[PDB]
Amino acid sequence: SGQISIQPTFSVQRNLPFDRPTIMAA
Amino acid sequence: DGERQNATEIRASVGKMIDGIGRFYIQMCTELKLSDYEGRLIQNSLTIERMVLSAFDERRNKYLEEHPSAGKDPKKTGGPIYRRVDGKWRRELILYDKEEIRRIWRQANNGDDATAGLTHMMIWHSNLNDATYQRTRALVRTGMDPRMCSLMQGSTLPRRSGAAGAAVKGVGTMVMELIRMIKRGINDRNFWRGENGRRTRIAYERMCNILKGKFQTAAQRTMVDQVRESRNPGNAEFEDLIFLARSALILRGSVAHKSCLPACVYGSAVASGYDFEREGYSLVGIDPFRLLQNSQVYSLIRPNENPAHKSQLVWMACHSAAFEDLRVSSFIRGTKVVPRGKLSTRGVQIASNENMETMESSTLELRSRYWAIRTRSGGNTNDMRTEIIRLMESARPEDVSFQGRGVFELSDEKATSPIVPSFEGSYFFG
Amino acid sequence: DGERQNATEIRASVGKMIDGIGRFYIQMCTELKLSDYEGRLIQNSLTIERMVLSAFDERRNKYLEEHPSAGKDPKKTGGPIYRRVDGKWRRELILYDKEEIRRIWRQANNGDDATAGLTHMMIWHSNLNDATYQRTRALVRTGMDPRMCSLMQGSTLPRRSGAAGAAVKGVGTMVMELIRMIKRGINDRNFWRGENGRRTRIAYERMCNILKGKFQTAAQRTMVDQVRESRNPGNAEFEDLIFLARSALILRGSVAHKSCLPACVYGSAVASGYDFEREGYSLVGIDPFRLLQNSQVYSLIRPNENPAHKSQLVWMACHSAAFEDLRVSSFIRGTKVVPRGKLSTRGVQIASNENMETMESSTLELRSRYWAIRTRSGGNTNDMRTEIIRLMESARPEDVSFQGRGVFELSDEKATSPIVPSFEGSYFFG
Amino acid sequence: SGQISIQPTFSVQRNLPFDRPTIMAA
Amino acid sequence: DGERQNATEIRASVGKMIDGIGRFYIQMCTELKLSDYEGRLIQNSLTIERMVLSAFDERRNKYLEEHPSAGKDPKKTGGPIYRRVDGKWRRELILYDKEEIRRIWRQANNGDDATAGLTHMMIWHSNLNDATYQRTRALVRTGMDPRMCSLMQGSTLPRRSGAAGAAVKGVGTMVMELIRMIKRGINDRNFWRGENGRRTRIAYERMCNILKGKFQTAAQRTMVDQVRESRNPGNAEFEDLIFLARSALILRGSVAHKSCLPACVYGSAVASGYDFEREGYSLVGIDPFRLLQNSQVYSLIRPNENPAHKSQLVWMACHSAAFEDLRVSSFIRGTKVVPRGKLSTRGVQIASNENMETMESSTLELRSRYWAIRTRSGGNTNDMRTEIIRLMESARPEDVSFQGRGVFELSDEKATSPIVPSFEGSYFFG
Amino acid sequence: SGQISIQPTFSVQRNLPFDRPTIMAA
Amino acid sequence: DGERQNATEIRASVGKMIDGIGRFYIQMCTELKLSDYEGRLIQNSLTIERMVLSAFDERRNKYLEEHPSAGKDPKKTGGPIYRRVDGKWRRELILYDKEEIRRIWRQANNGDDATAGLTHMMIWHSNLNDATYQRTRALVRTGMDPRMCSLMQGSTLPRRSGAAGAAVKGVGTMVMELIRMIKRGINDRNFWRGENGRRTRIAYERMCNILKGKFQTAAQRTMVDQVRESRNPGNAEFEDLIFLARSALILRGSVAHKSCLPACVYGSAVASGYDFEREGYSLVGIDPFRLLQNSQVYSLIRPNENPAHKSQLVWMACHSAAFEDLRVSSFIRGTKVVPRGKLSTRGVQIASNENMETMESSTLELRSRYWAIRTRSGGNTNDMRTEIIRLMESARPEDVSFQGRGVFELSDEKATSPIVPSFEGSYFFG
Amino acid sequence: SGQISIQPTFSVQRNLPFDRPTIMAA
Amino acid sequence: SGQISIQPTFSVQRNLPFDRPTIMAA
Amino acid sequence: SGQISIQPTFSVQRNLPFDRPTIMAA
RNA sequence: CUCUCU
RNA sequence: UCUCUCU
RNA sequence: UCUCUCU
RNA sequence: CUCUCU
RNA sequence: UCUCUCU
RNA sequence: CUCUCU
RNA sequence: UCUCUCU
RNA sequence: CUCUCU
RNA sequence: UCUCUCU
RNA sequence: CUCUCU
RNA sequence: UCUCUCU
RNA sequence: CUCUCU
């Protein structure tokens, strides 16, 4: 396993990624 | 906008705390007889910070007083000190009085305890620990899966931290404390009752209320309120808290992010004549970035190790970018950031069982091309369990949070013109 | 030490009250035509005491006047009287005027009401009831657990008792009254308000202040103060009062303990020529023990019952040792004290539905090897709920209260040399 | 259940006993 | 024993209520023009009782006022009245003003509302319903198994009953109300919140507290307290309440048992000149048994039905012996009691769709050889779920509760000599 | 099914019967 | 109707305050050397108002004196000033003495402090802030949900406002202050006690009494009284206050609404020769509407921004219609009012980090077709928690408050003929 | 979320709207 | 709410009415 | 508990001590 | 929730 | 005065 | 020289 | 609670 | 002498 | 999961 | 004509 | 809080 | 003018 | 928890 | 102003 | 479970 999504620290426009093939299913 | 007076007062207060920390480090360096090179070592600054933290730990001091240690007196502290003669580094252990350290700290702060500086040092240590090591063992031991590590920000912060420490720590650490409480409650029945029962109940109250305020959307807020309502929580709301931390990966709470620099940088700044009382300071503004821009810090480098990787680790620890997106971190720093997987460096601390014959000193490249304002938000998100689950379904890998909020050039001290980044690996612990 | 005059005045006052009680009992015995044996019956003395108490109950008298009873006039009183002819006991009911009883009481006290004697008789009755019966039904009905019975001292004392009655009654009885008030308040909303609202509020004030003064340590005192502060108390402070009574088992309050002898002993002492006005008296001194030492009291014994157990029950009721440690009680009395579990005797009172053909009379062995001074303290104890809980944690089954304070020989009338006891069952209601 | 701790009446040195297996737990 | 005044006051109050009920029934019989035989019909007395109950039902009256019925005005009441001319019974419907019934009730009680009489009549109706019909459909509908029916005492009592109605009703009825609340809570989410949320929460509080006081042993008391603690109870504590009612079959709570006679008996007693104000009364004493001993009541008998079985049903309803042991009930009555299975009789009420040509009238044999005092206890019983389960394991079919407490002869009005019964079928609904 | 154990109404010494073959098992 | 003298006196007083404000603005414009166009800028008037407010802030002045700022003296004030030469706008910072500003204010008011004008300016600033920005962060931080924003009227008013400021601020702001007090009380135990304890207790008293007077119906008034009664309030009455603010959305309190125009309009009116001392004034009458009808105000317009939206925002801020119904606001103004969601404009204030090269000036269309009298009521509304909940149930989306009270034509200066509106989006912050 | 009910400023006859699907339920 | 009890102006025999369901309770 | 602050009897310069951890909080 | 520790 | 990226 | 039944 | 800051 | 619509 | 019982 | 440091 | 009801 | 150790 | 509605 | 022992 | 939607 490992780190998955994100922890927004800086106020910059972005697209916070997540890994659905495992997070959505649980 | 009547906050300008309040904002100026807060800036003056944080500048005063930073100035006190810097002058205290200068006093400690002067009394401990280290040269300019030795005083700029990050290991020595970390040792001094541990000196202060252990000196002022009231509960630990009482514990050591009334249970004495084995061959280690409860009256004095120790810490690794590295000094250079003939060009070679060696480690020697110094013994300093806790009372003397406390007196120096009080004198350096105009006779004031100044717990704000202590909390700032603790937050810096916690950020370093988060950026250096993974505590997956504590995650698995308490029952939470090792799968999530983003919420573990500030998991190493002790309970003695004030409201700032509670605000800066992530949702995962609060959940970890809650599950530790629940595990201790399942262990024995005489809990929730008695004299200790009232104290543990109000502790649960306060920690659940700070988790209450940490969260963002209404459904998960209602869920944490309901699990709070339980008088004697157990296994079902054990899984409820597991799910609540689980939902934070998709709808995150508001976790504060601060730039807690090491005491070495503050000491060098004060030695240069900078007075933060008049100029002010801001843990989320340009001031820490500018301070790191014109400051030099040296660190001990182990054999067959990359100074660039250690400098990147130190920079991320300083700016609390351990869980920050790799792309935005590289854009802000200006150099592509190496995730923890291929970091060819161990921790910054040097263990006792190490050889003082193969270590070298290198400058830390704590310079960033861009600077940005740290945000305490979580990101745009726009029975209650099903409602919370339905919210995760909507999220698509394209929602743009902080719309119109870019990075700024170092010369842009007031942030006139944001820079829009255009977007590989994206996870530090991946 | 300027109290010697005050102590002598109090001794003279209590001696005067005791002398008045004794002469009143002598008058009642003379007018009711009982022999020396019949006049020394504890049942007859209890009947006379109930005569006086019912005669002077102003609220009960008014209630009976303005709501008449069924076939029982509100003007006269009754009570069981046992007389012996041909060696056999029988019970007959006498009818005496409340006005006549009141006139006799006033005449026996030099034309003074002397409510002190009435309060003393009420306290003796309450001590007998506490040493004889368990009111666990009242405990369970009001919501308090039946688990605690030590604090129920003086639970049968009516509200007409003065400050002495409030001081002698335990913490549990005050808590029981408080919970009865709270239950009546949850029953209806028109409470705390109106003309009756002011009176019930000042009643709550006074009873909460006497509980205020009853307690010992600062944290529980602060807790009772705070639950007092509530204008319209309810369920949360319902549980607060439950906890406050709950904490009294570990950190007890100061509950007065007095030696309230039956009117038979005082009457016999006065008939012997003893004048308590000059010699003085003390409800906590040697005087009641010495009076019981040289006094004889006879009691009715039911079939297949042990006179020794009834004598022990009467002795404990007299000395208010119902909740006293079994070991110290046995040491003071000189004979091992049987707890209530294996007491092979019913109550001293004989019910109306009883046969006057199988009852025998036996002497009560109210003689004790040692005598001790009664203490009004609670014992050494050295949010606020957690602080109170933490205090219970410290207590260990070895703390020695009343250090250096032992028992004294009957010949040791001034307590020169205390005797240190060396230490099985220890709970009367266990 | 039953009586638990003690109600000190006489001024004698003693060790006031309590039954923790149930009082401390509540 | 200072309760004698309190006991006498309670006896006077209950005697006054009984006298008011009797005089009210006499007034109703006088105004409705029924002969001595017609006035002694239990059906007519039940109709009059329903008259009073429907007249004073404030919520039902308001409901009928503001939602009018179909062809039935909300201003008047009706009820079956049976009268005899030429020896033959017929039923005719009378129309009487609710205001007139209320005025008659107030006048018969010296201008006092006297809700005690209304509650007594409601309890009599509930006892009759419990002794006549089984509400297994309501048990199965709410989720509880039909297996237990002992705890369903007073399940037909409406909410308008005071504290006496709550005390007399069994644990099963309280659990049924709790599960109805839980079902209504699972139905919609807007519950527990809003203006109605506060009222339903305090209703849950009060009903859970009366169930709190109903129970006997500490573990199940703690369990009901914990299920109370839940702010928003659901399915898990749904099963918790199912288990709590389930455990009541083995460790029962304290359920009051009262002798609520029909208004016919009280009316006949008052017509005979008996004044209960002076003589007093007691719902658990000998007084109801003696009143039934010298009272005659006639009832309508359906074709091919046994008058003895109907008399036994009426007697058990009067004495609330619906769930009482068959052997002890037969011993007290002196005639072997037929369980409900082989009772060859329908309900005492006669439906509208019945023929007024094949019905006969028979005297009810409400005479008992022995009389006993009703007990409000549950019987000797001497995580927490496992502890409760372990308690059921200990019970053996030989534990003797109420040791030394027997039955008494009717001539033994004060219960001098109890009679020990020596001990077939034992369950009424078996 | 049917009625199982008992509902003590009168204060008489007795042996309150229950039917274990079904009550204990659940 | 003896108020005519009182009403005329109040009109004269408010007219005198308005005249003083206008002459003060004229003096400031004359001394600061701005043309007619520059003097009519709303930004310049706002800067002058901040000048006055910062000059007279006694607590802030003392704070700055005894804690000096960083590079900013505590003796002088600053503010953005915009001037036009060659047609182009630029911002320059002026430095003026606090003493000089105070002297000018005193001279412009005939040597009188005239705190009424200061309070009026503060209320105008608060109305502008409420109509411009949403403080949902302060709502979520203190624990109240962000769901309600109608009650947040006057949340930015500092404590130095007099009784008028307390009356004009909404229920939500008072609740926010109460919860801030409660949070500070849960933080530390040494509160409610000591010298500061008395002051904070009387502050709680006064603020709870003004909330007492703010509310409308009796049940919620009783609730606020009871939460006041608590000596040391905590978490339960924390939720009680949350519910009390929660109930204000359905049964609102009486919140005053005033037309606080900017100092620019008053200065222009005084420059035109209007004397409000003789003609009088009324913050709820036609006078502010008529004054805005014949007054011209210019504002700075940011690039790609709509002047109409900024004019609508300024108009709503002037008339305190931030939370007013969209339909009635559009009917009164005569132009359909755009809610905050699609307002294509930022705040009226121009930040320091802004370019002085792309800004244009436009006239503010502060003209309304209709005028109406502001009402300080809340609307028709016709345990106590359940009673309050039941009240919310009754409300239906058709109750017509202010029956017969319409709007009036500008020519209808005395309101002879009201106009009945006939009734899309209806919420500004929706 | 957003603004819900109303804050009556002007004395005009109206029908003060509220959004029950969320306010009544809490 | 509204007017509750009475203000005796004329000297006429009467039964001065009050509304207890709310006055007595407060 | 015990004695807390001081009762100045002699006219000598001193620093009158108090125990804030309990006196200030009440 | 970009600029203010708590 | 101890330490470790990743059960 | 004003006015309004009913937060 | 339409016309009156507090 | 600061600022921001909408965790 | 190398150095710390639980 | 009494006495006790510290509920 | 051993010797004094309150 | 009543009474009962221990739901 | 046998004798007292609540 | 209705009623039914036992899904 | 014959008379009552849920």
PDB file of C-alpha atoms in Angstrom, chain C residues 289 293 315 319 321 324-337 366-374 405-410 419 421 423, chain D residues 9-14:
ATOM      1  CA  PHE C 289     -21.741   5.261  79.285  1.00  0.00           C
ATOM      2  CA  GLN C 293     -23.291   1.120  83.425  1.00  0.00           C
ATOM      3  CA  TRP C 315     -26.933  -0.917  72.963  1.00  0.00           C
ATOM      4  CA  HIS C 319     -24.732   4.611  71.259  1.00  0.00           C
ATOM      5  CA  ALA C 321     -23.073   2.393  66.556  1.00  0.00           C
ATOM      6  CA  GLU C 324     -19.684   1.612  63.422  1.00  0.00           C
ATOM      7  CA  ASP C 325     -16.911  -0.908  62.675  1.00  0.00           C
ATOM      8  CA  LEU C 326     -17.718  -4.330  64.095  1.00  0.00           C
ATOM      9  CA  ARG C 327     -14.227  -4.849  65.524  1.00  0.00           C
ATOM     10  CA  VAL C 328     -14.071  -1.522  67.373  1.00  0.00           C
ATOM     11  CA  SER C 329     -17.656  -1.973  68.582  1.00  0.00           C
ATOM     12  CA  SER C 330     -16.789  -5.410  69.973  1.00  0.00           C
ATOM     13  CA  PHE C 331     -13.636  -4.009  71.581  1.00  0.00           C
ATOM     14  CA  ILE C 332     -15.561  -1.170  73.248  1.00  0.00           C
ATOM     15  CA  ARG C 333     -18.424  -3.395  74.408  1.00  0.00           C
ATOM     16  CA  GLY C 334     -16.068  -6.234  75.353  1.00  0.00           C
ATOM     17  CA  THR C 335     -18.289  -8.852  73.691  1.00  0.00           C
ATOM     18  CA  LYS C 336     -18.121  -9.769  70.015  1.00  0.00           C
ATOM     19  CA  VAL C 337     -20.887  -7.897  68.195  1.00  0.00           C
ATOM     20  CA  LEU C 366     -26.265  -2.640  78.303  1.00  0.00           C
ATOM     21  CA  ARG C 367     -22.806  -2.907  79.880  1.00  0.00           C
ATOM     22  CA  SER C 368     -19.605  -2.110  77.980  1.00  0.00           C
ATOM     23  CA  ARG C 369     -16.062  -3.016  79.000  1.00  0.00           C
ATOM     24  CA  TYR C 370     -14.644   0.189  77.489  1.00  0.00           C
ATOM     25  CA  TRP C 371     -15.982   3.676  76.831  1.00  0.00           C
ATOM     26  CA  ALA C 372     -15.011   6.074  74.058  1.00  0.00           C
ATOM     27  CA  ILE C 373     -15.789   9.650  73.064  1.00  0.00           C
ATOM     28  CA  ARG C 374     -18.027   9.947  70.020  1.00  0.00           C
ATOM     29  CA  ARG C 405      -6.963   8.627  70.051  1.00  0.00           C
ATOM     30  CA  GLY C 406      -7.889   5.379  71.794  1.00  0.00           C
ATOM     31  CA  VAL C 407     -10.535   4.098  74.176  1.00  0.00           C
ATOM     32  CA  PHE C 408     -10.543   4.697  77.919  1.00  0.00           C
ATOM     33  CA  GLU C 409     -11.361   2.658  81.001  1.00  0.00           C
ATOM     34  CA  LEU C 410     -14.621   3.435  82.797  1.00  0.00           C
ATOM     35  CA  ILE C 419      -5.901   2.283  74.836  1.00  0.00           C
ATOM     36  CA  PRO C 421      -6.589  -1.478  69.790  1.00  0.00           C
ATOM     37  CA  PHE C 423      -6.500  -5.564  64.669  1.00  0.00           C
TER      38      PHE C 423
ATOM     39  CA  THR D   9     -18.728   7.072  65.387  1.00  0.00           C
ATOM     40  CA  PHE D  10     -16.035   6.560  68.042  1.00  0.00           C
ATOM     41  CA  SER D  11     -12.712   8.415  68.165  1.00  0.00           C
ATOM     42  CA  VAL D  12     -10.513   5.325  67.902  1.00  0.00           C
ATOM     43  CA  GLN D  13      -7.587   4.737  65.564  1.00  0.00           C
ATOM     44  CA  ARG D  14      -8.609   2.342  62.799  1.00  0.00           C
TER      45      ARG D  14
END
